């Protein structure tokens, strides 16, 4: 067991191993940058807030640990370390998770460099490659957006989740359809790609309904084939009253863009989620001919997420979170 040390960081206690110095807040879980003396690298440390306060907090805490322990891919956040000050299960009340510090998010990059077409290819390709891996574990991100995409000085990207969001959300999420296929994430990627291409937010909705109004103006009112799949009588009736709207020609909208990028966008920003390109399909799209390697887009090991259907006691979730902390093996 390492030896710990306590720190005050803006009204929060932080109790971390001595391995980790120069803690400097970044995020509020809350997150600090720190320097890892055992590798010499900069890290981000997340302290979970109140991990075990309710059954739902308890289950969420276990959820994040299991997910992060499973994610082993270049374009997805991975765990360098996980620790607790606790010497025993009875002591156990905080969880800390450790990852390689990436020093910027894609929001930062977007607001002060106009990306070239090659940049857009490389960045969207890596998002799709991480997303191929995430989706192959039967996980849905559900909140993909620039601020959830960490980028380094070589333009290498990792997908993560800090926990407006609405600007990149699939319109089925905002109408609470409740099924959601993985292509909700592909909607998000199309909003991100549009913005890397134009430098402008594609759908800067003011609020919830404005969001949906902006979406329908680009992609048009649901077509016959879509309206036909809507089982809720009420959802339906409303929509044919909703102005009606031509789907816009995207080639017109993204004027000077690579026509392969335009084509990819048309295949991601489809209203009907059954008709949106998948991440593995998008990787094979000709826009990414310079980056695609079919032997280097790996998928995840099976991920047991049967815990998701379970309704357990606080102490049960807590004990399970404790087992995962103990069983953790750091990467090489
Ligand atoms: C889907 C995907 C992309 C693999 C992730 C899910 C969660 C997750 O379970 N929750 C649970 C639900 S929730 O908190 O709303 C969203 C997050 C991650 N957590 C995560 O990225 N944590 C971290 C974020 C930022 C800095 C970190 C630094 C060190 C370690 C982890 C960090 S990443
Ligand atoms: C206000 C704009 C209307 C939004 C229409 C979005 C329809 C989403 O797409 C739907 O997603 C479901 C998965 O959740 C699938 O079961 C449906 O078959 C698919 O058509």
Curated annotation (Swiss-Prot):
Subcellular location: Cytoplasm; Nucleus
UniProt superkingdom: Eukaryota
Residues annotated as catalytic: 161
Residues that, per the record, bind ATP: 26-31, 46
Activity regulation (record text): Activated by cell stresses such as DNA damage, heat shock, osmotic shock, anisomycin and sodium arsenite, as well as pro-inflammatory stimuli such as bacterial lipopolysaccharide (LPS) and interleukin-1.
Modified residues (Phosphotyrosine): 303
EC number per UniProt: 2.7.11.24
Quaternary state and interactors: Component of a signaling complex containing at least AKAP13, PKN1, MAPK14, ZAK and MAP2K3. Within this complex, AKAP13 interacts directly with PKN1, which in turn recruits MAPK14, MAP2K3 and ZAK. Binds to a kinase interaction motif within the protein tyrosine phosphatase, PTPRR. This interaction retains MAPK14 in the cytoplasm and prevents nuclear accumulation. Interacts with SPAG9 and GADD45A. Interacts with CDC25B, CDC25C, DUSP1, DUSP10, DUSP16, NP60, SUPT20H and TAB1. Interacts with casein kinase II subunits CSNK2A1 and CSNK2B. Interacts with PPM1D.
One GO process term, biological-process aspect: osteoblast differentiation
PANTHER family membership: MITOGEN-ACTIVATED PROTEIN KINASE
Residues found modified as N6-acetyllysine: 46, 145
Modified residues (Phosphothreonine): 12
Cofactor field: Mg(2+)
Family: Belongs to the protein kinase superfamily. CMGC Ser/Thr protein kinase family. MAP kinase subfamily.
Gene Ontology, cellular component aspect: cytoplasm; cytosol; glutamatergic synapse; mitochondrion; nuclear speck; nucleoplasm; nucleus; spindle pole
Record GO terms (molecular function): ATP binding; kinase activity; MAP kinase activity; mitogen-activated protein kinase p38 binding; NFAT protein binding; protein kinase activity; protein phosphatase binding; protein serine kinase activity
Domain notes: The TXY motif contains the threonine and tyrosine residues whose phosphorylation activates the MAP kinases.
Annotated protein name in UniProt: Mitogen-activated protein kinase 14
Disulfide-linked positions: none
Keywords: Acetylation, Apoptosis, ATP-binding, Cytoplasm, Kinase, Nucleotide-binding, Nucleus, Phosphoprotein, Serine/threonine-protein kinase, Stress response, Transcription, Transcription regulation, Transferase, Ubl conjugation
Tissue expression remark: Macrophages, monocytes, T- and B-lymphocytes. Isoform 2 is specifically expressed in kidney and liver.
Post-translational modification: Dual phosphorylation can also be mediated by TAB1-mediated autophosphorylation. TCR engagement in T-cells also leads to Tyr-303 phosphorylation by ZAP70. Dephosphorylated and inactivated by DUPS1, DUSP10 and DUSP16. PPM1D also mediates dephosphorylation and inactivation of MAPK14.
Catalyzed chemical reaction(s): L-seryl-[protein] + ATP = O-phospho-L-seryl-[protein] + ADP + H(+); L-threonyl-[protein] + ATP = O-phospho-L-threonyl-[protein] + ADP + H(+)
